[PDB]
Design a protein around this ligand. Structure first.
Ligand SMILES: O=P(O)(O)O[C@H]1O[C@H](CO)[C@@H](O)[C@H](O)[C@@H]1O
Ligand SMILES: [Mg+2]
Length: 448
């Protein structure tokens, strides 16, 4: 047995048996040993248990001679921004994301908010913690509280020309996570008319744990949009590093289409830039990026792959279909705030609704949505799919699972690196009927 809470990208488990204040304190001790010189930024989400896990992190860190910058209740992206902006040695965000009520977790970064993942420190942290039986030392460094968000808010606003913004009517749905705080601090500097839904942070989640992808949660933002004649609606996950868009009809916009949209928005800022994208769904992104004068860069999905690739390529923007958007100027980190500011600016400047901006693209490259299969034998199931399609001679690429291009349609089939699952994505060249028959044909094969 190894500590179950240590995953590929972060730490998450049930408190107290998979994650607790003792483990959190040991993690702080262990993280001090893994970072270069400098202070460590700490932050936490709205969960009731999160501050105590932060305080243990801080105690272990300061017992190890690390100055601690407590930035308080915040979104994950604030930890990334402050870690990089303040030139810290690293940062930890205590966040349970959309795990159950009795779960919590941490996301860890080193200098310039570079991810710490299982193969880049996180398992080395785990191994140290698992063998650490030492007595907790006492503090030999200080903790300072740094709640000023001015630098962060100014950074967010710098992505748009505020004189070109229109008084759009925007539904905002923090899901009782933490996004409402940042919306409200931005609001005085924006002309938008906000319709606030599930706005107050409440770690008891009276309206459900924040997760806009679940249909009942999706419909609350949809309803608010349609009922209020909003221009569009934005919903966030709890630590708001993910945002989700609803057009003026209340229709949720599948994340695939936000990648090409945001890339076109950004490439009008940065001519000729590179855009990193994942291989699950591609054709639209590639065409929208080239059409906007940029260069698309294919990259294995997963935030740490995306971020490393953006760095090596100097890519201005990176987008994943699963509602993750990374920005070079934002320390190559993801933000749940930059994207909607960019979209609001695009609608304001173009005179086009969010619906119109994506409508033709969704018709031209219709996609299945990511479809998950839990199966008895992932390898055997994947082979059953590949054998069935072999006689059609698809063009195959193994960048991230299997990508098979048949000409008028393609799919990607992946093993998740964060769950024991197979994940299917299918798209076609403007053919809804071929999309359905091929999705069902593949689905039946995987379920075989
Ligand atoms: O499909 P996987 O392996 O479970 O990866 C998912 O989690 C990553 C990190 O959040 C994301 O970066 C991925 O894009 C995806 O959301
Ligand atoms: Mg999140």
């Amino acid at each position: 047995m190894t500590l179950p809470a240590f995953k590929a990208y972060d730490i998450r488990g049930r408190v107290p048996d998979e994650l607790n204040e003792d483990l959190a304190r040991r993690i702080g001790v262990a993280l001090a040993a893994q970072l270069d010189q400098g202070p460590v930024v700490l932050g936490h989400d709205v969960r009731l248990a999160s501050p105590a896990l932060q305080e243990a992190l801080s105690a272990g860190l300061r017992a190890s001679g690390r100055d601690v910058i407590d930035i308080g209740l915040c979104g994950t992206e604030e930890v990334y921004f402050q870690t990089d902006y303040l030139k810290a040695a690293g940062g930890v965000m205590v966040t349970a994301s959309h795990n159950p009520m009795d779960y919590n977790g941490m996301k860890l970064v080193r200098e310039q908010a570079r991810p710490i993942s299982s193969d880049t420190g996180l398992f080395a942290i785990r191994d140290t913690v698992a063998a650490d039986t030492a007595a907790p030392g006492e503090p030999t460094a200080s903790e300072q509280s740094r709640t000023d968000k001015t630098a962060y808010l100014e950074h967010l606003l710098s992505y748009v020309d505020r004189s070109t913004l229109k008084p759009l009517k925007l539904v905002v749905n923090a899901g009782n996570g933490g996004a409402g705080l940042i919306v409200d601090l931005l609001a005085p500097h924006l002309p938008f008319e906000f319709v606030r839904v599930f706005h107050e942070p409440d770690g008891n989640f009276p309206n459900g744990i924040p997760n806009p992808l679940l249909p009942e949660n999706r419909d609350a933002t949809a309803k608010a949009v349609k009922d209020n004649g909003a221009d569009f609606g934005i919903a966030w996950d709890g630590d708001f590093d993910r945002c989700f868009f609803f057009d003026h009809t209340g229709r949720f916009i599948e994340g695939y289409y936000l990648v090409g949209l945001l890339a076109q928005a950004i490439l009008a800022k940065q001519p000729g830039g590179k855009v990193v994208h994942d291989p699950r769904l591609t054709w639209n992104t590639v065409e929208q990026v080239e059409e906007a004068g940029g260069i698309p860069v294919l990259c294995k999905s997963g935030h740490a792959f995306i971020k490393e690739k953006m760095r090596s390529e100097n890519a201005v923007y990176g987008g994943e279909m699963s509602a993750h958007h990374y920005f070079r100027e934002f320390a190559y980190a993801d933000s749940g705030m930059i994207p909607w500011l960019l979209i609001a600016e695009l609608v304001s400047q173009s005179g086009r609704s969010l619906a119109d901006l994506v409508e033709a693209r969704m018709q031209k490259f219709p996609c299945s949505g990511e479809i998950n299969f839990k199966v008895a034998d992932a390898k055997a199931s994947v082979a059953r799919v590949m054998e069935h399609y072999a006689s059609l001679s698809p063009e195959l690429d193994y960048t991230d699972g299997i990508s098979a291009d048949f000409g008028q349609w393609r799919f990607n089939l992946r093993s998740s690196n964060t769950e024991p699952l197979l994940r299917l994505n299918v798209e076609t060249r403007g053919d809804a009927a071929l999309l359905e028959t091929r999705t069902q044909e593949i689905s039946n094969l995987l379920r075989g």
